[PDB]
Design a protein around this ligand. Structure first.
Ligand code: ZN
Ligand code: ZN
Ligand code: ZN
Ligand code: ZN
Ligand code: ZN
Ligand code: ZN
Ligand code: ZN
Ligand code: ZN
Lengths: 348, 348, 348, 348
C-alpha cells in the first residue's frame, strides 16, 4: 500500500513498494495526492544525473506535490490529520547564514525532493517537515496544490525582477515555466508579451492572460527582425524579460530587446555555455538575474490560485495514475505541442 | 589662448584654436586644469568610433577633467569665480523618466563630453552645466579632481553591488578601472583580493589597499587552478566580483568563483560577444550587473579623496602638457606595464 | 475669458480676470477643464495659511487639475495642441541632490500650485511645464485626470509601504484620502480593511473594493475594543496601516494594531503634536513612514484608471462651475457625510 | 562550581548554585567568561518586570556574554572544545515566516536570555544553540566578545538606517547605546555628531570617533536653540538621527533637526507615551524606524572589533566578579557620570 517510483539509474525506473515512513517530532505523514513532473525529473531519468548531482543509489523520484495529512509528529501544532497541503520540496538547514538571512533556497545543505541523494514524493506515502507543507483552503484542489511548485518558480522570478503595476514583461517561451511566468506576471499587475515557437501553446499563453503573443523561432528568423516585430507589438521595450528557454539566441534577444535599466531573468537552465552579447547589456545597465526555485514564494502562489487570479489547472494536459508513471515520463520526455504539464495521481 | 585637441576622424587629432565659449544662464566658464584619458578616448582616436557612436564631424576630445571657474551664468548661485571644480561629464535631459527616477546616467538624451556628437573638454577653456561641476576643498588638488571621474566609476560599481563591511570583493584586472575599484571597495570597508597579469600593477593594487594580490593570466593557466588559487588565498568565496577586463575567460572565472547569491559587476566593456557559463550562474543565483559610468557618485568619490581614504594621485604614471596630446594618446595607446593613468595639464 | 479664483487673504476669495499666460520654451498653455479641491485649499481659505507657508500676496488657488493643450512652447515635442492632460502640480528645480536622486517631491525649491507664493490653476487658462502634464488616453475623461492628483497620493503611500500581493492593509478613515488609499491598495493586490466614523462613506469604501469595513469612532469606543474588533475581522494583523486622519487616537491604534515588522504610513497631516506610544512601535520594529504628495506616481495612477482598476469618478459628490467657486469651497469646508470630493469645471 | 545569579522577584537577586546544564544535539556547553549588564537587567531587578514580560518564577539573569566551549552536542561540527565565543542571546524558532524571511529578531517564539521565562547566562556554566555562538579570533578577548551584544544593537541601527560613506549621523545621548552607535556609525564611514548632558561621556564619545560633540540638555535649553547649535556645528542637517534616550523632547528635536527624506532611528525605549510633532515629520518625509536588538549583526560587530575599527573595551568603566553581582547591579542602577558599562567576570 506504498507503491513508489524508484529510479535506480538512467532509464531504470521501477514501481515498487517501500516501507511507510514515520514522522519525526516536526514532520507530518502525507497520503500523497498529485505529483507533477518536469524536465528535471525527465533528465534524471534519461541520463541518471541532472548536473554534478548524480544518482549514485536508487532514489524515489518526484518533487511537485500535494497530499493529505494523515499523522503528525509531537511538536506539530499548525497542521492536523485530514488537512490538505501542497509540499514545498526544499527543506533548508535553518542554521547557516543563507537561512538566517532569508535566502534558504541557497542553503548549501538544502535537501531537495528527488535531487540525489534525497528521496522524492512520487509514492503513496511521504513524510515532510511540517513548516514546508502549506495548508490548502476549500476552494483549492489537491491538483492545484501540486501546481504551486512550478507557479512559485514564476512568482520567484517576478519578485526578484520587481514585477508590478507599470511593468512590461516579455516572456520568452510558452512551455510550462513560460506559462507560470505569464500567470504570475499578470497576477502582479504587469502587461505581458509572450513569444514562442508553437502557435498552440501561445494559445494557452493568451488564455493565461498574455496581452500580446507572437510566433517566434530564432532558428528560422533573424534576431533583428524578431526584435522589431516585438518592439512594434508594444509600446516601450519590456523592462523585464524572462527567458524560459536557456537558448543563447533567445538570451541574446532578451539582452537586446530589454529596456535600458531593465532586467533579464534567467529561469530556463541553458546547455552549458552560451555565446552572448554581455557588452550590449553593460552599455545600457541591463541586469541579468538568475532565479533558483523559490523562497517564501509558496504562500503568494497559493493566494494567487485561492483568490482566482491564476488558473493553473488548465496547465495539466495529461493525467496518469501512479501505476503508469513510466508512460507519464515518456509523455513528458517527448514534449509534443499538445503537452504542457504531465500529472500523476497517487490515491489508490 | 584656447588651444583644443580636435579629433577629425580616426588618427587625425589636431591641436588647434577654438573660440572661447560663452556660459548660458545655468553654466559656468572653466579655465581647464587637468584632463585624464582612457581607453575610450584612445579607441575613438584609432577607429574614429567607440560603438554605434561614430565621430561624423570634428569633435573636441576629453572627458575626465577639472578646472577653475572663471565666469558664471546669471542664475548660477552655488559656484563663483575662482572656485576649483571637478567636471562630471554627463549632463542629462532632466525631464525623462530616467532622470526623474534618479537614473540620469541612463538618460537617452544624455550629452557626454567626447562622445560624438558632443565636444569634450581637452581645451584651455570649457563651458559646463553648473550643477555638474563639483567644488573642491582646499586639500584636494585639481589633478585629484580630474581623477574623480574614473574613481566614480569604481564608486558606482561598489554601490550597485552593495559593497560594505563584511563584503569580500574580488577585482579582476589591475589596469586603472581595477585600481579605482580597489580604492572604492576598500573605502567602503570591504576585504579586497586583486588578480592581474602584471606583477608591477599588482604592486600598485597593494598600495591601493588590496588585502591579497595574485598574478593570474587565464591565457596561460587553466581556469580550474586559477580558481583554487583564489579560493585558497581567502576565506569564503568573494560575494562581489568586479570584472574590469571584458575578457570572456575572466568573466567565466568571475561566474565560477563568485559566492552563491553574490554578484558579478561588469565594468570592463567586452569585445562584442563572450561565450560564458550563464547556466552556472543561475544554479547559484549569481546576479550579473552592469555598471555604466556613474550616477550621483561624484560627491562620494570626492569625499573619499578629501577625507584621505583614497590616494588617487598615485595613479598618474605619465603627465603631458596640452601641446603634447598626441604623445599622451600614444603613451595611452601602447599600454605598457608601467602605464596606469595618462594625464594632460592645460594651464598655459 | 480668463476668470480665475484669486485668494487675497483669509476668507477673501475673489473671482476675477487675469491675463492669459504665455508658454516658455518647455511649457504648454492649457485651457483648464476640471479642478478638484481639498482640505489644503480650504485651510488656506479659512486661515490664509496652511503652515509656515503663508499667503502674503493674492494667489490663484487650485492644484488638482486637468485641461487641454492649446499652445506649446518651442522645445516641447511630446505634447501637441488638443492633447488632454492631467496636471502634476509640483515642479521641482531638477538640479539639487533630491531631484538628481529621484526624490523630486522633496526638492527644496519645489514650486507647488496654490502653495504661496506660487499661483494655482483654478482659472480658465494655465501654463505648466510640459514634462509634468500627463497625456490622457481616449477612455480617461478630463474629470478623471483631475482625480489623478489625489489618487497619486494613494499610489505614493502604497509604494512607499511596499503594498503588494499578500499585503493586508488597514486604512483608517474614509474621507477622500482614505478612499484613494483603498483604491490604490486594491489595485496593488492587497487585502484591505477600512475603518471610519461614517457608515455612509464606508459604503463608498466598499464599492472602492475594501474587503472589510467597520464603523469605528475612537472618540466613543475604547482603543482596546476597537483593536479586537479589527483583529477579529481579519486573519493576521495588517502589515501596512495607512492613517488618513492625523488624529492621535487613530495613530495610537495604528501603532498597536499593526503587525510586527509592518509599517504605519502617515498621510493624514495631524494637528501639531500627538501623544503616541512610540515605545510600542520600537518593541516590535513597526516603522512609521510619512508620505508627502507623490513622486513618479502619476503614470501609475493613470494606468490604474485607464485599465479599469480604479473607478475614481465615483468620488465626485459635488460639481460646481468656476463661477460658483465660493459655494464649492463652502461645500468643502462643511464636510458633510454625503461629501467626498468637490469638483469645479472650468470650460466656459 | 556553578554559582548563578538568580532573580526571584523585584529586588530579590540571589547568588546560588544551579546544576550544570547538559548540551542537546545542536548546542554547546559554555564555561562563561564575561557578562555585561544593561538597563534592561536593572529594570527587571528593581520592578521584577520590563514590560508585559513579567518574572513570574526565579530566572537566571544576564544576556551580554561570552565564554569558552567546554563540550559540544552530537551534531555540532563548527565549534569544538576550547573555542572562545560571544553568545548571541536570542534564539528564534527557525520555522515561522519571520525566521524564513530573515527577520528572526521578530520571531514570536524567540527565546531571549533573561527575558522571562527564559534563563540568562550570568552563571559559571551555560548551554546555548551552537549556531548562535560566534567563534572569536585570537586578537579578540572574551571581554570584547561580551561587548558584541551591545555593539550589534548599534550595527543593527546603522544598517536599518543605511548608514554609509556620505551619511551624517546625529547620535542623541552618550550612555552605552549612544556610544556603540558612534562606534558603529564611524565604522560605517559616517560623519558623526554626538549630543549629551554629561561632558564626561562626550569625552568618551570623542575617543569613540565622534567628529563633533555638544553638551545639550533639553531640560534646560529650549529646543530651538539646541537645534541651531547643532545646525551650526555641521554642514547640512544629519540625514540619520539615532535617538538613544527615549525622551520625548529629544525625539522632538530628532524629528526637527533631521534632514528631509532622512531617518530617525528609535533605539532608546521611551517611557510609555511621548508627545511628538509627527506632523513635522510627514511634511518632510522623515521616516521613523525602530531598532529591536539585532539580526545577523553579530558577525559585523565582530569584524569591526577584530579589524581594529572599534575599541569597545574602553566602554567598561566597572568590573566585578560573579560573587559581587549585587554590587554590580547597584553600580548599574545608580548610573553615575563615570559609569558606562558594568562588566561581571565569571571564571573561578
Ligand atoms: Zn519540477
Ligand atoms: Zn542553511
Ligand atoms: Zn574615461
Ligand atoms: Zn533624461
Ligand atoms: Zn489637494
Ligand atoms: Zn531640486
Ligand atoms: Zn543588555
Ligand atoms: Zn520564528
Amino acid at each position: 500500500d506504498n507503491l513508489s517510483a524508484v529510479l535506480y539509474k538512467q532509464n531504470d525506473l521501477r514501481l515498487e513498494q517501500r516501507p511507510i515512513p514515520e514522522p519525526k517530532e516536526d514532520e507530518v505523514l502525507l497520503q500523497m495526492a498529485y505529483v507533477g513532473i518536469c524536465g528535471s525529473d525527465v533528465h534524471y531519468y534519461e541520463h541518471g544525473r541532472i548536473a554534478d548531482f548524480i544518482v549514485k543509489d536508487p532514489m524515489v523520484i518526484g518533487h511537485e506535490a500535494s497530499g493529505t495529512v494523515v499523522k503528525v509528529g509531537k511538536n506539530v501544532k499548525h497542521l492536523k490529520k485530514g488537512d490538505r497541503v501542497a509540499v514545498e520540496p526544499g527543506v533548508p538547514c535553518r542554521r547557516c547564514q543563507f537561512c538566517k538571512e532569508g535566502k534558504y533556497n541557497l542553503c548549501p545543505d538544502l535537501t531537495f525532493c528527488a535531487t540525489p541523494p534525497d528521496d522524492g514524493n512520487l509514492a503513496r506515502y511521504y513524510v515532510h517537515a511540517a513548516d514546508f507543507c502549506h495548508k490548502l483552503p476549500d476552494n483549492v484542489s489537491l491538483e492545484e496544490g501540486a501546481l504551486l511548485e512550478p507557479l512559485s518558480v514564476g512568482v520567484h522570478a517576478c519578485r526578484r525582477a520587481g514585477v508590478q503595476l507599470g511593468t512590461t514583461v516579455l516572456v520568452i517561451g510558452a512551455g510550462p515555466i513560460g506559462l507560470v511566468s505569464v500567470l504570475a506576471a499578470k497576477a502582479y499587475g504587469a502587461f505581458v508579451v509572450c513569444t514562442a515557437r508553437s502557435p498552440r501553446r501561445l494559445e494557452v499563453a493568451k488564455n493565461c492572460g498574455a496581452d500580446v503573443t507572437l510566433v517566434v523561432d530564432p532558428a528560422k528568423e533573424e534576431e533583428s527582425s524578431i526584435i522589431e516585430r516585438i518592439r512594434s507589438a508594444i509600446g516601450d521595450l519590456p523592462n523585464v524579460t524572462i527567458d524560459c528557454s536557456g537558448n543563447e539566441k533567445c538570451i541574446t534577444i532578451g539582452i537586446n530587446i530589454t529596456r535600458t535599466g531593465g532586467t533579464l531573468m534567467l529561469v530556463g537552465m541553458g546547455s552549458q555555455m552560451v555565446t552572448v552579447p554581455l557588452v550590449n547589456a553593460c552599455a545600457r545597465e541591463i541586469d541579468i538575474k538568475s532565479v533558483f526555485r523559490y523562497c517564501n514564494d509558496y504562500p503568494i502562489a497559493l493566494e494567487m490560485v485561492a483568490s482566482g487570479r491564476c488558473n493553473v489547472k488548465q496547465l495539466v494536459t495529461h493525467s496518469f495514475k501512479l501505476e503508469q508513471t513510466v508512460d507519464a515520463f515518456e509523455a513528458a520526455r517527448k514534449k509534443a505541442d499538445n503537452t504542457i504539464k504531465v500529472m500523476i495521481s497517487c490515491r489508490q
